[PDB]
Each structure stands twice: as structure tokens, then as C-alpha cells.
Design a protein around this nucleic acid. Structure first.
Ligand SMILES: [Zn+2]
Ligand SMILES: [Zn+2]
Ligand SMILES: [Zn+2]
Lengths: 49, 168, 118, 65, 107, 196, 144, 56, 94, 87
DNA sequence: GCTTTATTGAGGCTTAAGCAGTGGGTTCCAGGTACTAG
DNA sequence: CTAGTACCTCTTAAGCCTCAATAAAGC
């Protein structure tokens, strides 16, 4: 668990955009459930925006 | 003609305003749910009825606008094929898109599409199409129409086999 | 309200003392006994008004997904707000909306007849 | 009510009766006549009684009672 | 005719056949609260005599099993007390024809 | 213009069509039909993401429909046909105290509805208080000519280490992660049951 | 409806209420197991009124049900009818008292006459009790 | 009464989409489904359980 | 030494030949149809086939819910491109 | 550079996407466009037409046509006779 | 008065059913192993 | 030595058995 989810999510997004982390990884933050999910497994469908 | 399109747009705007007022009344728990039917189902039925009435009015306006010289109107009057719904969707309004006998459900978390915020019950976000095939459909309207078409195709594909088995 | 032993970290069963005519919470595992603060034993809440406003956090207003609104806040008169629906999902739940103000993080119901603190 | 036995080495010769009212599990073999009794709970099953009997037999054999 | 209030124990059910010559029919109080025959759906049922049954079979040239069957426990059969091998004529009102006359034989 | 992306086998060009499957390592909670005694079932298809992949479908079911007066939760541990209460699993893992089990299952003690719904579960699981007893009870089902007290406690511990939630870990150094994941699964199941 | 009564809406709604299946679950907002040390004195200061009208031996356990006034008005249910139904179903096993409808807050107190089985009794009294109507009936809707 | 109700339901379902079928066909269908003592469903457990020709 | 190389080559060839994706030839639950002969009637057909997706759910049944495309398909699966008939709603094109 | 980001199905549940680059940010012939009620639009689509597949994209004005007709066209396009390769 | 009965029914598991017709393209001639004839 | 030859490898409708109460007959 993490106490500052916003800062961690912002750092992860910045790293992914910069290219340090593979863009294919999917990071989702749900405030209602207060849950952070990271997915790196293959077979995941993604599109560019 | 221009006046007919203006009248259709005015009717659609009036229907949207009525739907918005009904939604606001429901939010303030000022709407009395129908006996037996739950509040959500009653609100959905009222919205669907209002949208259908608006679409029918737009279709009637388009039909009266069209003259006997019109080819589509002449063919419809001939009875060969077509109907009021066809003319209304081609010239006036496609209308509400129904899936499983109800509007487009929130496939995402309280969102029909990612382009709409959570808790968006406006007609445009609930499968309603306010643009006829002549003018075109927005991407959300196109996706809703595609969902309706897929539902219809699946229904036909299952019901043909069911009817064949019943006939056997 | 349900509590524990506070010593062994275990649940407490209810029992009746007719000599003292009182409801006492005690666990058969140990000898610990306590007097119930309030006469609450069982509750089911077939229809519950709580749990509809859940998940609210300090940075709730910063979520792009939540739809904005320009309603004036009762206290700070801040137009900016984020509005959502009942968290609980049911076929009979009312469509009453809840508005949260970024400035003060105060949750208020959209209903005007009655004012709800949360 | 069928289980293996160790005294006679005969399969399906064991029957277990669980009295939840008295909370007593009784295991009896129809060949060698061995009878065993144990304490059981409402969630108990005949396998539990068999395991308890086997553990008791092992303890008796080891002589570490 | 014997009418009960709540239910009938199986002992009475098995005792009823103890008297062949005398026929005893059991009916429920709730069942008889409203007359079934007065319903619009149920057509008019008329009992037929043995001679009438024989004449019908001779004219139509039918056997016992060829006629339509009706359940022994059918509410109409209990109302009329139809016995085994007994033919009842049903007169019904239809849109295609003014009236239609069918027959049903208890199984 | 040819884009390739196929295999030439015996001259014939063969293309492999993408196969859709339910994502693993995720808890999915589904309701059950009224005739069935079960009310809500939460299933997870745990599988290794690195190698030696094997399907581990772990399902936890809430027995008793609405108003059944029996709100019990049982998890179908792999290779164990008879569903075991979650309390015994928690005891085997190492969380013996009831308060710790409730805290793991329910994070916010303020919500009393979850505690009320779980009360029958702890009431029925109160019989077990020792890790060895829990492991023995888990090993009772699926007997394969073994002695529960002799080289079966280790077997049950190994099953709980590997068979139970293999994806989260495969080592006995830290077995609390399995307990926390089970608590999260039970929390999701209870939230779905309560309709929140 | 009958031709004579088919022209009256009040009679139609009366028949609808008579045949409509009514259960405590629909009306009961909540039910709780409170503790009443003595019949004369109640833990809740506001609850005393329920026994006050009684003034103008029993087990030390209390079961308090809070209902919905709006549901009562919509379904025409009355406290007296439900009390009579409960008494008929339970002759003397449990003593039940209900507040007057005029009161702003309406509650029902049930207590077992001379705890483990109390939950089962409450569940049976809630689920397996019908105030009025016919079994296997969900809802009745009138139409013209 | 059961046969009449079955016929009325068949007519209602047929006319739901506006299609019209002659009354004689529905009458024959309900008669065959009710020719026996009770109601013979159109399934392998109904008319197929009768004493008709084995090959049929 | 004495490694039977054919055990792997022949197995892969069989898997890519009949489409039977199974541990062994004798297996009857291999879930055939994984590999399909590439269609070259036209370039568009080949492109669509190369980017095709299949659903393991049996083509039989009458459950419309899985066949219908969920709102999540937006931007991932073509709303219109799909076969008509038994396979409708199961075979998807990205 | 972070100009374009990959988004999966799960992440789309926690983002708002604009239809066009400059429509949602700031002669009754043009199709009615939904008003930009929101003001965040953390992401946006490069172009909506890209949602269509290989066969669907071939269809001219798919929106102007009914969805079942678009599906039929997509199915039929695989059977069209034409040059599949230059060799 | 207590004990043992036939009856009643109620659900679990099971074995069944699953539009019609038509056109075409791919792949199987099965794996290894021992025993024995030229 | 080398190569033949055979050989072991998703939604209901009825049937039946298995369950928990119940009124009468034994005694
Ligand atoms: Zn304690
Ligand atoms: Zn404020
Ligand atoms: Zn023995």
C-alpha cells in the first residue's frame, strides 16, 4: 500500500511518458475504491491517444 | 427545405429540454415513481417515451414537408416497401437506440463511453441519435447504432434457429 | 457498534445476567467481561441510507472523470464542484446526486427540501 | 459409513456414527469388533473420527501417553 | 358427497374404495367456494347416457380410446362426478361457427 | 505489399487467430441463480506469469440466499473437493486471532454491516484455534492412504504454499501475502453481496 | 371487477390492497435487538411513550422494528391490522405492542414471553408472516 | 378452459407482431395439444410419448 | 545424443496444419480452428484475416450477451466488421 | 517525448477522451455536435474513424449507412475479386 | 403411554434435446518398438 | 547388416434415488 497515491501515480505516468518504462504497461488509479493496478502481462489490447 | 430542418431541430431541442427537466426533477426526488415499477425503470421508460414521441413528431414533420413528387414518399405511399420509420430516420431523426429492450447501459464504470463523465443520463450519452443519415452520425452515435445493429443481427441469428426448431 | 476484548483481540459474545439484569459482552476463550456501552445487539438495515457516499478523499475533486458543476457552495459560496450519484448500486436506489466542493471538501445533497451534512 | 481398518487390514469394514446432540463420534469395525469413541463438533466428519482413532492408536503403540 | 375444510388424510382416501356399490366424492371447501361452471371459458357440459354413448359410437364409428380423453381428477369431471368410461358432450361457442359439439370420455 | 505474418506449412499459408481468454490474477464476483443455494461466487484464475504455467481456479462461495439466516463463506481450495470455511484457512496461514482475521477481511471497522454478515462465519470457525488443527482439517479431504499426523501436515502446508494463490508467490518466507489477498477477495465478495 | 363496482376507483384500489401481497420486509425500514431490563423502564428515553399508553413476567429481551410511514400510506397498511395478524400467528408466544399512527415516529416492540433462538424467531416473524394478500403475488396494477 | 386459454395465448402471441393466422389452425393446434386427458406439450416428452406408430 | 528431433518438428507441423492445438495428436479437445488457411481473395481480405480474433466459446448456443459487443470494444474492436450467422459476435477484428 | 500514450481497456475507465483536437477544448448542414460540458479532457482521439476495422474503413461514409449494412459490406468485402498480390 | 410403520412430498444428479439447404479448402493415412526374413 | 511386419497405444423436460415430516397400527 501507498499513502500518497497521487504523487506515485504522477511519477509513474511521467516515467512512462519519458520512456523509462515500457509504454505497454497499463496503470489505473481508482479514487472511489482507492486502488492502483499495474498490468504488464501480454495479450492486452491498447490504442494510442 | 430549410424551414423543415429548423422545425425538426427546434422539436429535438424541446424534447432534450423536457428530458433535462425530468432528470432534474428525479434528482430532487420530486418525481413519483409508477406503482410497482421502480424509480429507475420509471425514469427510463419516461425518457424513452419522450424521445420516441420527439422522433415521431420529427418524422411527421419531414413527411408533411415532402411532396407527392418526392420519390421516397411516392414509393412509401405505393406500399411497395418503406414506412414512416424509414423516412424519419433517413431525413428527420434516427431515434433512440435500444439494446436488450433498454437504452445503452454503462459498459464502463457509470459511463457508456469514455468520452462521457460518470452519471451522465443525457440522451446523447444514452444511445439517442439526433442526426439523420443525411447529415451523418457522430462517433458516439455511430457506436450506439452499431451496438443496436449487432443486437438485431444476433437476435435474428438466434430466432431463425429457434423458429426452425419450433416448426420442426 | 461492535468491539473486541482489547486484550486478546477477539470477538465478545453477548450474555444476560438476570441477577444484575444486564447485557454483558464476554468471550468464552478468556475470563474478560465488559458492560455494553449501548443496547445494540443486532441490526440488518434492509434499506440503508449509508454507504451511498463512499470513497471520498482529499483529492477527489482532482479526478477528471467526475463531472464538474457551477453550483454555489452553501458555506464558502464556491461555484466549482464535482457531482456524482449514489455509490451503492441497486434497482430501487434514488437518483439523488451528491456535490463535493473542492475548496472545503464538503459533501451536500442536490435535494433542496432537506439539507444533508454528508 | 465405510472406511478402512488397521487391526484386520480390511477395507470398507469401518462405520462411524456422529451424535451431534451428544457430540460423540463412535467408530466400529464389523470384522474385528474394535470400538473407539471420541469428541466431535457439528462440523466433524467421519474422516475426522478415523484420523482421531488412528492418532490414538499410534499414541498407544508408541507408549508416550 | 362429502366436503372437507382443510384436507383429507390418506386413510380416508384409501377407505373410499371400500364401498364399490356406493360412490363417495370428496371436495374441498376452497374449491367449491366459487362455481367453476359459471366461468366463461368453460363450455356447457352435458352427461350422456349409455344408450346415447352407444348411438354416438355407432354413428361416428369410434372405439372407446378414439374419443378425446378427460382426466379423472379434472375439475369439471369432479363437478359432474363423471365415472370411468363415461362420455360427456361439450357445447362451446366459437367465432368460426355459432356452436361446436365435442365429446370427452374419462380415462 | 505482402505483410507476411503467417506460417508456410507444406506450402499452405496458415495464420493463427488471436484467442480470447479470461484474464488471470483478477477476482471476478458473480451472482448465482435463486434455485442454487450459493449467493455470490468470487473466482480467480491464478497462474504463473513466468513459467510452469498451470490453471488454478480458486473460487470462494457465499452459501445461503437472501433471508436464509446462514451467511457462511467457503473457499474451494485446489485439490480439496469439500469447501472449507475461510476461518480455517486463515488459521492455517497463521492469523489465529479472530480480531486479526476480521481486520484483514474488513479494513474500515466503522462499517458494521460487513461484521454483521461475517459473524456467522467466525461463529462456525471458532472451533479451530491451532494451526496444526487447521492443516489437519484441510488435509482430511482427498485422502490418498496417508496419516494426517505423519507426513501430511507438511503436505498440507506445501499445498497451501503452492496451490493456494500460486501467482502471488511460491515461497514460504512470507505467507502473510496470501492471507491479505484472501482478505481482499472476501472484502470484494462482501461488497458485491451488499450491492455497494 | 363486478359491473356494479367496476365504475368505482375507490373499490378498485380497495380490492387491489386486499389481494396485493404485503410483507414486513417491504414496510420494515429496520429491525434491531434492543435490551429492556424491565417492562416498566426502557433504555431509550423516547421509547417510553410506547408503554405510556399501556399504563393508561416477561423475558429481559426486546425486538424493535422501525417501519416506513410513506410505505404505510401508499399500501394503506395500518398498525392495528398488522398487530392483529401477528397476534393471530403468535397467540401467546410473543407479546407485541405498536404505537399510534398519529405519532411522528412509529415503532413496534416484540418480546418473547417466559436469546439463542431469538434471531430465528425474528427471522421467521419477518419472512414467514404476511399482513394481507395472496401467496405468490408480487405486485398488482390497476388500469382503465 | 385450459384449451381456450391456450388458444387465446397463441392468438395473442401470433397477433403481437400483427401477423394474422386463421382460427382453424390454432383450434387444431390446441386440440392436438389437449386431445389427451391433460395438455400434451409439443416436445419429446409429450406427443412423442403417446402410443402412435413406433416408426412415427 | 540420440535426441529424436522429429518429436518437436512433426508436432509443430501437425499443430499448424489441422489447427488442433493439443499436447498430442490423440487429444480430442485440442480446440481446433486456431490455425486457418490465409485468405487471399483480395488484399483487404488478407489484411482482415491477419488481424482477426476468435472467441473460444462454442459457436453453438443461443446466449446473446457474449455475442453483443460491449462498450469497451470502442477503439479496440471494429464495431461493424464481424461475420454473420453462428460465428456472429464471437469472431472479432481489431 | 510523451506526445502519444498507449491506453488499454481498463485505463479507459479512469480518463475522459475528447472527440477532436480542437472541438471539445475551446447553414444547418453539419451534423449536430455534443456540447463540451466537461473541461478536463485528459486525453483525446487521434481520429474517430480509426475505430473502424480494415474492412469497415473501406466503406465510404459508414455513419451515413445503417450498421447492419456496414456489417454486411464488411463480410462481403472478403469475397470481392481483385488483385491480392503482385506476384 | 411409547415404538415402529406405510404414506406424503422435495431436491440432486442424470440423460437427453437442440433451422434447412448449398459451395469450397486442409489433413489422416497415425507414434515408436521388438521380432524376424533376405 | 539391413529392411519387412505386426502391435499397443447455454436452457429446460422427464427418470431415478436420495432425502425430511406425518397419521395408524402394534404392542
Ligand atoms: Zn477475550
Ligand atoms: Zn465549499
Ligand atoms: Zn477391523
Amino acid at each position: 500500500v501507498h499513502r500518497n497515491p497521487a504523487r506515485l501515480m504522477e511519477t509513474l505516468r511521467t516515467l512512462r511518458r519519458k520512456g523509462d518504462i515500457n509504454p505497454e504497461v497499463s496503470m489505473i488509479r481508482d479514487i472511489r475504491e482507492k486502488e492502483l493496478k499495474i498490468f504488464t502481462d501480454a495479450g492486452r489490447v491498447y490504442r494510442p491517444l | 427545405d430549410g424551414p423543415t430542418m429548423r422545425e425538426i431541430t427546434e422539436t429535438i431541442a424541446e424534447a432534450k429540454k423536457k428530458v433535462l427537466d425530468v432528470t432534474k426533477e428525479a434528482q430532487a426526488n420530486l418525481l413519483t415513481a409508477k406503482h410497482g415499477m421502480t424509480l429507475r425503470e420509471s425514469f427510463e421508460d419516461n425518457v424513452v417515451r419522450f424521445l420516441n414521441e420527439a422522433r415521431d413528431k420529427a418524422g411527421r414533420l419531414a413527411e408533411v414537408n415532402l411532396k407527392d413528387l418526392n420519390n421516397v414518399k411516392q414509393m412509401v405511399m405505393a406500399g411497395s416497401k418503406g414506412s414512416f420509420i424509414n423516412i424519419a430516420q433517413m431525413s428527420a431523426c434516427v431515434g433512440q437506440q435500444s439494446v436488450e429492450g433498454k437504452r445503452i447501459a454503462f459498459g464502463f464504470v457509470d459511463r457508456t463511453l469514455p468520452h462521457f463523465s460518470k452519471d451522465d443520463y443525457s440522451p446523447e450519452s444514452k444511445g439517442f441519435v439526433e442526426n439523420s443519415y443525411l447529415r451523418g452520425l457522430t462517433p458516439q452515435e455511430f457506436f450506439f447504432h452499431a451496438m443496436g445493429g449487432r443486437e438485431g443481427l444476433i437476435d435474428t441469428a438466434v430466432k431463425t434457429a429457434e423458429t426452425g426448431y419450433i416448426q420442426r | 457498534t461492535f468491539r473486541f476484548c482489547r486484550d486478546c483481540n477477539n470477538m465478545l459474545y453477548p450474555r444476560e445476567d438476570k441477577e444484575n439484569n444486564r447485557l454483558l459482552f464476554e468471550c468464552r476463550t478468556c475470563s474478560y467481561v465488559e458492560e455494553a456501552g449501548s443496547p445494540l445487539v443486532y441490526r440488518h438495515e434492509l434499506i440503508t441510507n449509508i454507504g451511498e457516499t463512499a470513497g471520498v478523499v482529499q483529492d477527489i475533486g482532482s479526478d477528471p472523470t467526475l463531472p464538474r458543476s457551477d453550483r454555489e457552495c452553501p458555506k464558502c459560496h464556491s461555484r466549482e464542484n464535482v457531482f456524482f450519484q449514489s455509490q451503492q448500486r441497486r434497482k430501487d436506489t434514488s437518483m439523488v446526486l451528491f456535490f463535493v466542493c473542492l475548496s472545503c471538501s464538503h459533501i451536500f445533497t442536490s435535494d433542496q427540501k432537506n439539507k444533508r451534512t454528508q | 459409513t465405510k472406511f478402512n481398518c488397521l487391526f484386520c487390514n480390511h477395507e470398507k469394514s469401518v462405520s462411524c456414527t456422529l451424535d451431534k446432540k451428544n457430540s460423540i463420534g463412535t467408530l466400529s469395525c464389523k470384522i474385528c469388533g474394535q470400538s473407539f469413541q471420541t469428541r466431535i463438533n457439528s462440523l466433524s466428519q467421519p474422516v475426522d473420527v478415523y484420523s482421531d482413532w488412528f492418532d490414538a492408536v499410534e499414541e498407544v503403540n508408541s507408549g508416550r501417553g | 358427497i362429502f366436503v372437507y375444510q382443510n384436507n383429507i388424510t390418506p386413510s380416508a382416501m384409501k377407505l373410499v374404495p371400500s364401498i364399490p356399490p356406493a360412490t363417495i366424492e370428496t371436495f374441498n371447501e376452497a374449491a367449491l367456494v366459487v362455481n367453476i361452471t359459471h366461468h366463461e371459458l368453460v363450455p356447457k357440459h352435458i352427461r350422456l347416457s349409455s344408450d346415447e354413448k352407444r348411438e354416438l359410437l355407432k354413428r361416428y364409428r369410434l372405439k372407446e380410446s378414439q374419443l378425446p380423453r378427460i382426466q379423472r381428477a379434472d375439475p369439471v369431471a369432479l363437478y359432474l362426478g363423471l365415472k370411468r368410461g363415461e362420455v360427456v358432450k361439450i357445447i362451446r361457442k366459437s367465432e368460426t361457427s355459432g356452436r361446436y359439439a365435442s365429446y370427452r370420455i374419462c380415462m | 505489399f505482402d505483410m507476411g505474418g503467417y506460417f508456410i506449412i507444406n506450402g499452405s499459408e496458415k495464420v493463427l487467430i488471436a484467442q480470447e481468454r479470461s484474464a488471470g490474477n483478477i477476482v471476478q464476483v458473480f451472482k448465482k441463480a435463486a434455485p442454487s443455494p450459493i449467493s455470490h461466487v468470487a473466482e480467480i484464475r491464478s497462474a504463473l506469469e513466468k513459467g510452469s504455467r498451470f490453471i488454478s481456479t480458486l473460487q470462494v462461495k457465499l452459501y445461503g440466499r437472501e433471508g436464509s439466516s446462514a451467511r457462511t463463506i467457503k473457499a474451494t481450495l485446489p485439490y480439496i473437493k469439500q469447501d472449507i470455511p475461510i476461518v480455517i484457512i486463515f488459521r492455517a496461514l497463521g492469523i489465529i486471532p479472530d480480531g486479526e482475521i476480521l481486520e484483514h477481511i474488513c479494513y474500515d471497522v466503522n462499517d458494521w454491516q460487513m461484521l454483521e454478515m461475517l459473524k456467522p462465519c467466525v461463529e462456525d470457525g471458532f472451533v479451530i484455534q491451532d494451526r496444526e488443527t487447521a492443516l489437519d482439517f484441510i488435509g482430511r479431504r482427498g485422502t490418498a492412504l496417508g496419516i494426517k499426523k505423519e507426513k501430511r501436515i507438511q503436505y498440507a502446508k506445501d499445498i497451501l504454499q503452492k496451490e493456494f494463490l500460486p501467482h502471488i508467490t511460491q515461497l514460504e518466507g512470507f505467507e502473510s501475502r496470501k492471507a491479505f489477498f484472501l482478505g481482499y477477495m472476501i472484502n470484494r465478495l462482501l461488497l458485491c453481496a451488499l450491492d455497494r | 371487477l363486478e359491473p356494479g363496482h367496476a365504475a368505482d376507483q375507490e373499490q378498485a384500489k380497495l380490492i387491489r390492497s386486499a389481494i396485493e401481497h404485503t410483507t414486513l420486509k417491504s414496510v420494515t425500514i429496520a429491525s434491531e435487538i434492543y435490551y429492556d431490563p424491565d417492562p416498566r423502564s426502557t433504555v431509550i428515553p423516547e421509547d417510553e411513550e410506547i408503554i405510556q399508553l399501556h399504563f393508561s413476567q416477561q423475558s429481559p429481551w426486546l425486538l424493535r422494528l422501525e417501519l416506513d410511514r410513506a410505505a404505510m400510506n401508499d399500501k394503506d397498511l395500518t398498525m392495528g391490522q398488522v398487530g392483529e395478524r401477528i397476534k393471530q400467528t403468535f397467540k401467546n408466544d410473543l407479546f407485541v405492542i405498536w404505537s399510534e399512527d398519529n405519532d411522528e415516529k412509529l415503532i413496534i416492540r416484540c418480546r418473547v414471553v417466559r436469546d439463542h433462538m431469538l434471531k430465528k424467531i425474528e427471522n421467521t416473524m419477518l419472512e414467514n408472516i404476511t399482513l394481507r394478500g395472496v401467496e405468490n403475488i408480487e405486485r398488482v396494477v390497476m388500469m382503465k | 378452459a385450459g384449451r381456450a386459454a391456450l388458444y387465446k395465448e397463441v392468438y395473442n402471441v401470433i397477433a403481437s407482431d400483427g401477423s394474422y393466422v386463421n382460427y382453424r389452425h390454432m383450434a387444431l393446434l390446441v386440440d392436438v395439444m389437449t386431445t389427451q386427458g391433460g395438455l400434451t406439450s409439443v416436445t419429446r416428452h409429450g406427443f412423442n410419448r403417446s402410443n402412435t406408430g413406433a416408426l412415427m | 545424443l540420440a535426441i529424436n528431433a522429429k518429436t518437436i518438428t512433426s508436432g509443430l507441423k501437425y499443430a499448424l496444419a489441422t489447427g488442433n492445438w493439443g499436447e498430442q495428436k490423440k487429444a480430442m479437445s485440442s480446440r481446433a480452428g486456431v490455425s486457418q488457411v490465409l485468405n487471399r481473395y483480395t488484399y483487404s481480405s488478407t489484411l482482415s484475416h491477419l488481424r482477426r480474433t476468435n472467441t473460444p466459446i462454442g459457436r453453438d448456443g443461443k446466449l446473446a450477451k457474449p455475442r453483443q459487443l460491449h462498450n469497451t470494444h470502442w477503439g479496440l474492436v471494429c464495431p461493424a466488421e464481424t461475420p454473420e450467422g453462428q460465428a456472429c459476435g464471437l469472431v472479432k477484428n481489431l | 517525448e510523451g506526445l502519444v500514450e498507449y491506453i488499454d481497456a481498463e485505463e479507459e475507465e479512469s480518463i475522459l477522451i475528447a472527440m477532436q483536437p480542437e472541438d471539445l477544448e475551446p447553414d444547418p448542414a453539419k451534423r449536430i455536435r455534443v456540447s463540451h460540458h466537461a473541461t478536463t479532457f485528459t486525453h483525446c482521439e487521434i481520429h474517430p474513424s480509426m475505430i473502424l476495422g480494415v474492412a469497415a474503413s473501406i466503406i465510404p461514409f459508414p455513419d451515413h449507412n445503417q450498421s447492419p449494412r456496414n456489417t454486411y459490406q464488411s463480410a462481403m468485402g472478403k469475397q470481392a475479386m481483385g488483385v491480392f498480390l503482385t506476384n
